[PDB]
Every structure is written in structure tokens, then in C-alpha cells.
Design a protein around this nucleic acid. Structure first.
Ligand SMILES: [Zn+2]
Lengths: 340, 207, 199
DNA sequence: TATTGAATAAAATTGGGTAAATTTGACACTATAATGGGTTCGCTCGTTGTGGT
DNA sequence: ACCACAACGAGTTACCTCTCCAAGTGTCAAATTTACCCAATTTTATTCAATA
RNA sequence: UGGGAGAGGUA
């Protein structure tokens, strides 16, 4: 007789994004741990609380091993002969009957283990709300900064984390304002924080262009490569199979509208739009703009270019402290050399 | 997490009103060993403890401690902001002092600041929608439209601007927003960061 | 909620629970020290919140005040010494304890031994009186002491004044037994009645 | 080749008000006749104001 | 102008132990709060060109 | 918890 499991199934039921069998597993692990700690002998009793009755029978376990320690769980092949060799070497089934009592020490350790189980079950709730949609621009309010991370939320008691290295260098987020970020690939097994969200990745700019531009949305214009100097300067690479709509004019929009939108959403980062081409030589003479081309030596084995450049455009060709050469090399994959 | 219990413990002895008191055990902690743990956790993470006690108006002397630590942080961090990095010594010390004091008053500002509570919600930021109660029957809540949910009038950053242009007169509002105000927001983010790391070190001590 | 005195004390170590018994009271003879427990009395703290954790707790166990504040009597500091006497008083209606039953049984056995020695010496004096009136009436010395003293009533003779005195001291010994068991019952109900404690 | 001041649009704030909920405080319970109260000393010595032939 | 009454205040310091110290409940007018509108008003990041 | 009386005691 148990009206209490009936309270589990209707009266003290969970939030409805959590299954009932996990709650039954939580309570069965709770009573198993409670009878485990209470017995003075080192018995790893695992009790099978059957679902429909509520009451149960305490089950001290036994695994088929040939070791010398743990006699309370040490059964052998000749003990598996009692069930005549119909099992496996090492599974922890039982062949015993025990009883159960209650105590306030059992109550408090059961409270500890059930708040651990509902904690990891809520963690699995955030796991399935992550795995329902893989990679998108999201918005949450920052609520508690830290030394190495910025904790976030997505509503419904979810949490996300901006780490230190994947944010803007000009970040200033007082707790209480809404920020934009992209969850990319989080750890569903992480016991602490899981949802790793960035603000200074190429995935950020391409997802921002995806939500911004409808022809990125429906695959008319496509972006192939990207380049980032976070907060200051950027480059992305555009090719297009369609011949109707102007690609660069489309992604700059009406008087630099889309570029200024991503620039103010990114923090003043000068995203410099440039074409993507398939062939290496003509791709890179398209790609180092606004620098000028004298002669190009294309190298295959160590994946580099050699660029002759006339005098006058060296500063805007290299950027500031080698910014443009570095950004163009991690754009194209070919690191650049200086030639006059 | 851990820190606000110590702010409960900084009060005087309050009278109890219940039946049989005095558990007389070490169930949670005493009231003196929490202060001893605050002392043990002061050699590291003293910024956040000073800022927390100055924010919650318990031990109203470490407001100056938090302003001094913020001034030291601004002196260490001022070499990345173009508006402040070109000024001379005592003038840069005085602008760092005035924006440190205003940044700390902006961090301190909650619904208990005199003259800062919302007019309608009285700080709760949660009013009752009468139409949803009339159609649903039950009682509902909504966001207080005047305060927009936060429950208090926020501190405008232009107060520090008005208090610095009595000293730097040739600094207008666009360059204030362009190369001065990020330092101010860096100061308030540093206040929140130091309070979080002090709560973390407190929980590491009293564990 | 009403408090209770039981050995079940939350969040304390089992070293301090060795000095207590299974009923929540310290053993007679245990050398206690400062900061030790003598009697385990817990207090209901109060519900005041409805979280799923405490809802599952009160579902799985039924300890409907599962937050309890341990307010046991502890010995004050700097004080030591053994335990030489434990007295447990109870009010009416409440069933007391196993330990209070044991103290009650010990007091009952002691009072019954005292009343048994009282009855032994009183029947000794009464049988000395019937021996005195028997030797005043007739001369019977060997035939009275060759037979046991408790069966000094079935011996008789011709009906006379001494036979009337023999039967009247027989019924006086019977009503002595009557008031003896009445004293027993009064002592038993006096040590079994609940105490007139404070409200 | 940047950076900065005038202008600016959008959002947050603020003082005032205002119609409509809603809380506050007060009441309310009824007939034979009945008609002026129970405290305080052996408990020394200096000062100071208040009232008195 | 020059004397007998009430009342205040004072009486060391610190420490120790003990005992003892009914019932909402319905109703009614007036005052008060409260959720909302809104015009003004301030704030703050963004733009244009003009120097740097 | 922690307040007030009364009683006795120590220097
Ligand atoms: Zn409000």
C-alpha cells in the first residue's frame, strides 16, 4: 500500500520536461544508498524498488568474480552453478531477502542524494534543450560574472557560460543587460557548467550574417572562409553560384547597413568583405585587398605565397603591427611573404 | 551562494520570538568563527569582501577601502584607454578618484538607496495584472512597467561625466562615450568580479 | 509540534551516540565530559516552504517535520564526572518510554521488596502474639514448634475463649493481608500515575 | 591615415495626474433591583526650594 | 526681612550561588493606494565631415 | 536566549 508513489506520478510530479522513470531511479538509488551506509558491514546493497507497489524487498548484491576481497558481493562460478551458468562474469544480481528501517540519518543522506539526482536530471534537461537545436544566435541576460567566465541564462532555469578567451577584448557587461552569443558545441557530460557560448569566433560572424541576411538564410549567397581580429578588423570570403544578385553589394546593403549592423553588434570590428575564389593564385590576389599586386609566387609544399608589393601601400598592406598579413594568412591558409 | 549569510551575521544581537531555542551544537557554524573565516580569507580576496560590506551598508568604513582598491585597479588598468592614458600625474589621479567613486556608487545602487526605489512597485518590480486575474480567476503577476522589472531607478553614467567636466572642461560627451566610459564600465565589472571571487574563496574556506 | 526524547538525533556522529542508550537517555555509570550529550531531545523546526526535495522526503519516509533542530541537553563545559542517578517524570496520557518503564520496574521491585519485608515482620509479630495467647490459654510448646510457623492456624482444641481469640486473630491476619495488598496497589498506582507537571 | 565635436534618434527617467480597486475603522450583539475605594511608619544626613509672623 | 517642611539624592568596587517572576463575523461609508498614461526630459550610442 | 527582584556569601 503506497499512496506515495501515486503522489510521485501526479501530486509531487516533476517539471514536465523530466521523465518519471528517472525519478523512480532517483528514489531507488536513494533507498539503496540509505541502506548501504546504514549497514556496518561493507555491503553494496542495491535495492530494486518495483514501480507499481511502492513497497519493496531489500537486495544485497553479488557479482561473479574470482577475487579475494568483498565477500558480501563475491560469488564464484560454482555459485553461478546455483543458477546453472545462465549469467555473465561480473553482473551484480541478487539471490537474497533483507528488510528495511528508517532513520533521520538515512533521511538526510537521502535528501543529499536526491538533490544530487534532481540536479543531474535538470542538467539532462538542459542537455536536451541544447541538443534540440545545434548552433544558433541566442540572447540572455548576464547574471553573475566570475574571474574566468560570465554566467548566462536562456530562461526556464537554463544557464550558459561565456569564457574569458572567446569574448571581445572591449567587453563590458554589467550584470543585467542582454547579450548576443552563439552556442556551438557544449559538453553534455560536464558536471559543472556546460553551455559554452562565444563572442569572438568565426562562427559568431557567420551566424550573425545568417540571421541578418535572408539570402544567407535561404542559400543564395554563401560565405566560405572567415578571418578575425576581435573588436578591430575582420574579413570573410564570399562566393556565389547564382548570377543575378550582386554578392558584395548584397551583404553591404543600403549604404553599408549590414556591415554597420554586424560592426556595432561585434564592437567596432572592421569586417572587410572580400570575394571567395576556388583557385589559390587568383583567390589570394582577390583576397589581400585593399593591397596592390605586382607579382605572385605560388608555393605548394609548405602552403605559402610570395607577394611583390610596390612602395607606398606597405602600411595598409600589413595593417598595424602585422595585423593584415596575420588576418589574411588565417583567412586563406597561406602565410604571406614580403617582396619589393 | 555563501556570502550573504555573513551579512546576516554582521548585525547586532536580535531578539528571538519562538519556542525552545538554543540548538547548542556545531550544525551550521557559530557567529564568531564566520568572522574568523572572513579574517582567514582576507589575505587573498579582500577586494570583494570590502566591496560587499560597503555595498550592503554593514561596516560603513570599507566603502573607502573598496574605493581605494578600485583606484589601484584603475591605476593598473589605465594603460589601455586612449582618453586617460595621455593625462599627467595628479590630474589622472583625480579623474581616477572621481570615476572610481562614481563607479562604486553605481555598483552600490540597489533598491535601498535613498531616493532610488521605484514609484509604483515599491521596489518589488512585480505588479498584478487585473485583466488576467479577471479572465483567469487566480491571481497573476506582471512586470512593473515604470521600473521595467528591476525595481529601482538605475544610476545614469552622465553623473560622473558632469563631475569630471568640472575638472576636465574640454572633454565633451562623444569622446566621453568613446574613450572614457569603457573604463567606468570596466570598474563596475571589476567590482562584480571581485565580489564573485571573494564569495568563491569564502565558500572554499568555510567548507 | 510536540518535542520527543528519542535516541534518533540528526547530523551527529556515532561516537557521542555510544553513551546514550537505545531510548535516548545516558546509561547510569557513563563518565561524561564537557560538550557531550546526556539526553536526546529534538525539536520540530517548521515546514515554511514547499520544495520538491522535501516533498519527496515526506513522500518516502513520513517524518513530516523532516527539518528538526537538535536541542538536546548537553553537559556544560569544564564539567565532568560520572552519572549516578537518572529520574524521568512524565505527564498523564503520554506513553512514557522503555527507559521510563525500566526505571518504573526497578522502583516497583524495590518498593515490593520493602513491603514484603514489612509483611514478613508484621506476620512474625502477629504469630508471636498468637503463640503468646496460645501459651496463655493452654500448654502447647513442642506441638506448635514441631510444625511450621506459617501454618499456625489449623491447630485447634475445644471451643472456648482461646479458640475465639485464635479465630479472631486468624481473621485479623486475613485483613492484615488485605491491607497489605491494598498498600501494594496504592504504591503501584502512585508510581504508575503520571506526574502533576507544569502546564 | 584616424578622431572628434555637432547633431541626432531611440530609450530610460520623472513629475504629475487619474480612474478604479481596496483598505480602514467603526460598529454590533438590550431591561425586576442594584447608586462613594484599599493603600502607611527605626527608613540617617545634607541640600534646596517653598511657603509662612 | 527672616525662619520650619517635603522631596531628592547619596551612600565603595568587583565577583559568586540560590529561588521566583472568547470568538469571528457581517456590514458601510470614506479615505487611501495602485496600476496605468503621458508629456517632458535626460541619457547614450551612432553618424558626417573636418581635421589629425 | 536574557531582563528584574529578593536572599546569602568573598576580598
Ligand atoms: Zn517598479
Amino acid at each position: 500500500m503506497n499512496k506515495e508513489i501515486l503522489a510521485v506520478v501526479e501530486a509531487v510530479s516533476n517539471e514536465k520536461a523530466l521523465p518519471r522513470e528517472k525519478i523512480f531511479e532517483a528514489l531507488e538509488s536513494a533507498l539503496a544508498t540509505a541502506t548501504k551506509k546504514k549497514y556496518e558491514q561493507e555491503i553494496d546493497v542495491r535495492v530494486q524498488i518495483d514501480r507499481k507497489s511502492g513497497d519493496f524487498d531489500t537486495f544485497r548484491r553479488w557479482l561473479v568474480v574470482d577475487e579475494v576481497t568483498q565477500p558480501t558481493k563475491e560469488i564464484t562460478l560454482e555459485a553461478a552453478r546455483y543458477e546453472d551458468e545462465s549469467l555473465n562474469l561480473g553482473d551484480y544480481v541478487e539471490d537474497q531477502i533483507e528488510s528495511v528501517t528508517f532513520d533521520r540519518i538515512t533521511t538526510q543522506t537521502a535528501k543529499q542524494v536526491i538533490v544530487q539526482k534532481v540536479r543531474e536530471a535538470e542538467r539532462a534537461m538542459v542537455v536536451d534543450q541544447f541538443r534540440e537545436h545545434e548552433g544558433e544566435i541566442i540572447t540572455g541576460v548576464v547574471k553573475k560574472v566570475n574571474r574566468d567566465n560570465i554566467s548566462l541564462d536562456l530562461g526556464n532555469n537554463a544557464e550558459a557560460v561565456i569564457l574569458r578567451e572567446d569574448m571581445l577584448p572591449r567587453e563590458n557587461f554589467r550584470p543585467g543587460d542582454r547579450v548576443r552569443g552563439v552556442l556551438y558545441s557544449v559538453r553534455p557530460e560536464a558536471r559543472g557548467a556546460q553551455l559554452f557560448v562565444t563572442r569572438s569566433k568565426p562562427e559568431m560572424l557567420i551566424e550573425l550574417f545568417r540571421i541578418e541576411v535572408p539570402e544567407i538564410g535561404e542559400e543564395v549567397i554563401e560565405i566560405k572562409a572567415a578571418a578575425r581580429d576581435p573588436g578591430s578588423r575582420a574579413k570573410i570570403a564570399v562566393k556565389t553560384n547564382d548570377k543575378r544578385i550582386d554578392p558584395v553589394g548584397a551583404c553591404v546593403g543600403m549604404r553599408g547597413a549590414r556591415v554597420q549592423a554586424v560592426s556595432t553588434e561585434l564592437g567596432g570590428e572592421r569586417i572587410d568583405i572580400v570575394l571567395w575564389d576556388d583557385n589559390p593564385a587568383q583567390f589570394v590576389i582577390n583576397a589581400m585587398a585593399p593591397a596592390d599586386v605586382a607579382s605572385i609566387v605560388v608555393d605548394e609544399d609548405k602552403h605559402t605565397m610570395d607577394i611583390a608589393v610596390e612602395a607606398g601601400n606597405l602600411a595598409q598592406a600589413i595593417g598595424r603591427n602585422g595585423q593584415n598579413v596575420r588576418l589574411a594568412s588565417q583567412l586563406s591558409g597561406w602565410e604571406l611573404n614580403v617582396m619589393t | 551562494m555563501r556570502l550573504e549569510s555573513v551579512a546576516k551575521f554582521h548585525s547586532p544581537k536580535s531578539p528571538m520570538m519562538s519556542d525552545s531555542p538554543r540548538a547548542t551544537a556545531s550544525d551550521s557554524l557559530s557567529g564568531t568563527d564566520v568572522m574568523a573565516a572572513m579574517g582567514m580569507a582576507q589575505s587573498q580576496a579582500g577586494f570583494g569582501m570590502a566591496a560587499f560590506c560597503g555595498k550592503h551598508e554593514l561596516s560603513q568604513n570599507d566603502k573607502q577601502k573598496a574605493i581605494n582598491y578600485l583606484m589601484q585597479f584603475a591605476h593598473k588598468v589605465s594603460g589601455k584607454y586612449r582618453g586617460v592614458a595621455k593625462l599627467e600625474g595628479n590630474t589622472k589621479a583625480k579623474v581616477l578618484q572621481v570615476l572610481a567613486t562614481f563607479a562604486y556608487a553605481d555598483y552600490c545602487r540597489s533598491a535601498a538607496t535613498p531616493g532610488a526605489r521605484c514609484r509604483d512597485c515599491h521596489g518589488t518590480g512585480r505588479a498584478v495584472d487585473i485583466a488576467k486575474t479577471e479572465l483567469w480567476g487566480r491571481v497573476v503577476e506582471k512586470e512593473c512597467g515604470r521600473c521595467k522589472g528591476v525595481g529601482y531607478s538605475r544610476m545614469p553614467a552622465s553623473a560622473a561625466y558632469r563631475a569630471v567636466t568640472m575638472l576636465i572642461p574640454n572633454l565633451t560627451q562623444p569622446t566621453w562615450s568613446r574613450t572614457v566610459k569603457p573604463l567606468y564600465d570596466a570598474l563596475v565589472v571589476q567590482c562584480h568580479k571581485e565580489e564573485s571571487i571573494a564569495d568563491n574563496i569564502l565558500n572554499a574556506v568555510t567548507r | 509540534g510536540p518535542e520527543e526524547i528519542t535516541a534518533d538525533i540528526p547530523n551527529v556522529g556515532e561516537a557521542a551516540l555510544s553513551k546514550l542508550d537505545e531510548s535516548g537517555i545516558v546509561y547510569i555509570g557513563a563518565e561524561v565530559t564537557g560538550g557531550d550529550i546526556l539526553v536526546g531531545k529534538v525539536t520540530p523546526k517548521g515546514e515554511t516552504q514547499l520544495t520538491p526535495e522535501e516533498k519527496l522526503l515526506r513522500a518516502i519516509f513520513g517524518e513530516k517535520a523532516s527539518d528538526v533542530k537538535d536541542s538536546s541537553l548537553r553537559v556544560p563545559n569544564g564539567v565532568s564526572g560520572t552519572v549516578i542517578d537518572v529520574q524521568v517524570f512524565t505527564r498523564d496520557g503520554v506513553e512514557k518510554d522503555k527507559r521510563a518503564l525500566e526505571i518504573e520496574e526497578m522502583q516497583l521491585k524495590q518498593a515490593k521488596k520493602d513491603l514484603s519485608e514489612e509483611l514478613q515482620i508484621l506476620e512474625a509479630g502477629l504469630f508471636s502474639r498468637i503463640r503468646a495467647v496460645l501459651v496463655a490459654g493452654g500448654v502447647e510448646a513442642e506441638k506448635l514448634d514441631k510444625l511450621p510457623r506459617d501454618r499456625w492456624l489449623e491447630l485447634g482444641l475445644t471451643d472456648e475463649e482461646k479458640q475465639n481469640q485464635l479465630e479472631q486473630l486468624a481473621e485479623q491476619y486475613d485483613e492484615l493481608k488485605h491491607e497489605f495488598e491494598k498498600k501494594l496497589e496504592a504504591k503501584r498506582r502512585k508510581i504508575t500515575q503520571g506526574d502533576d507537571l507544569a502546564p
